[PDB]
Write a protein that binds this ligand. Structure first.
Ligand code: HEM
Ligand SMILES: c1ccc(-c2cnc[nH]2)cc1
Length: 382
């Protein structure tokens, strides 16, 4: 029975998913090219699945060390403990000033051209990426290079040839970068990894490259998607945009509801048992595959009321946009501070911000290859 993918509203979960979940939060279904796993759609259930260490992870449709996202234990746990040791709350909080300066520079450029602009190119894709460039200690004069190579590999309208080329060049640049930090260390996170406590000498150029490239895809893709879709969604919900413009102290809460309303987690691991297990009272044989649908769980009417209303005033609750358990996003705190600053500054600084074109004209894609809006033409009052 094939999982509903089709959207009659581009901001909302696929129409079928609600009926499936109400029937069977845990249930058999047929996938992409599938093949044919357990679909988990309930909030309690997706939470009990991600939480249970007797499932292991697999790339969704190969690692390796320091990339975390698809590593099994024991090395996911030790690799994560290594990275987490320099990639910390303080290093993340410490980045606020950078994040405001980068967001101001990009709004500065946009005010210079005047509108309309495409917010996706000129801002949503460029900020996350430049914040990673700072985190990696990329100097001012190497920044254009770093944007271009990162943007290039992220670009999705090209033959397999050119895509693979642009990735290989990213790999190559990050290798070059790890070596420059070996030669001339500073404060960035790559320097601090090179000196981390490492008894089994696990942190080698390859571990740094895997970990740096994971951080950077997380920013350049997921965070970028989340700024373009959420802007789009807010510029298409006047009641909410009004609350936000009267009372910007609601930004942090609007950021939390944007994450619950839009997060799909296409990238987050198929689980597999390990051994037998009951989830939601349903018997999962070891090693059948399990797909956690976090969008569905975040729209489970047992988790929040009227889950399809987009309401920036909801009480805080723990949504699952950042996963849960062993693999829960180790960057959620940088994502929450970037999003907070991005949205507070964009709406203050571009009064009247609105779509340039009516909303049925935007083009979306909703898969693993790509998730969000291809361009976001906006204008505002000059
Ligand atoms: C921005 C919106 C983001 C969302 C919605 C998000 C979501 C997630 C999710 C749902 C997971 C777990 C996937 C799974 O369990 O199967 C995850 C993992 C991870 N995220 Fe993010 N993330 C975001 C931003 C970031 C940022 C900014 C970073 C770092 C710069 C980041 C770094 C990572 C890494 C390294 C993992 C794997 C961690 C592990 O497996 O232990 N994420 N992210
Ligand atoms: C590949 C690597 C990382 C990610 C990601 C992590 N957190 C958000 N996105 C997505 C794809």
């Amino acid at each position: 029975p094939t999982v509903p993918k089709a959207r009659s509203c581009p901001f909302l979960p696929p129409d079928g998913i609600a009926d499936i979940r109400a029937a069977a939060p845990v249930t058999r279904a047929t996938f992409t090219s599938g093949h044919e796993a357990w679909l988990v759609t309930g909030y309690e259930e997706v939470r009990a699945l991600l939480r249970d260490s007797s499932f292991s992870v697999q790339v969704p449709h190969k690692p390796g060390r320091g990339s975390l996202l698809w590593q099994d234990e024991p090395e996911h746990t030790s690799d994560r403990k290594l990275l987490a040791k320099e990639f910390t709350v303080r290093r993340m909080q410490a980045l606020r000033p950078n994040i405001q300066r980068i967001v101001d520079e990009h709004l500065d450029a946009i005010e210079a051209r005047g509108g309309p602009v495409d917010l996706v190119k000129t801002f949503a894709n460029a900020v996350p990426s430049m914040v990673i460039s700072d985190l990696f200690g990329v100097p001012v004069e190497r920044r254009a290079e770093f944007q271009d190579i990162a943007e290039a590999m992220m670009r999705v309208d090209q033959d397999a040839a050119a895509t693979e080329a642009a990735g290989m060049r990213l790999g190559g640049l990050l290798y070059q970068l790890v070596q420059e930090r070996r030669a001339n260390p500073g404060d960035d996170l790559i320097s601090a990894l090179i000196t981390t406590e490492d008894p089994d000498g696990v942190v080698d150029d390859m571990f740094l490259m895997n970990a740096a490239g994971t951080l950077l895809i997380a920013a350049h893709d997921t965070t970028a998607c989340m700024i373009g879709l959420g802007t789009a969604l807010l510029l298409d919900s006047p009641d909410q945009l009004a609350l936000l413009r009267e009372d910007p102290s609601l930004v942090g809460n609007a950021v939390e509801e944007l994450l619950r309303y839009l997060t799909i987690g296409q990238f987050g691991g198929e689980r597999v048992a390990t051994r037998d297990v009951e989830l939601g009272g349903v018997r999962i044989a070891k090693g059948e595959q399990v797909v956690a649908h976090v969008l569905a769980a975040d729209f489970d009417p047992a988790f929040v009321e009227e889950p399809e209303r987009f309401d920036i005033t909801r009480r805080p609750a723990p949504h699952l946009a950042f996963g849960f358990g062993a693999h829960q996003c180790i960057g959620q705190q940088l994502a929450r501070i970037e999003l907070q600053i991005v949205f507070e500054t964009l709406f203050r600084r571009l009064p009247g911000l609105r779509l340039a074109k009516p909303v049925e004209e935007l083009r979306f894609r909703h898969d693993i290859v790509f998730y969000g809006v291809h361009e976001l033409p906006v204008t505002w009052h000059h």
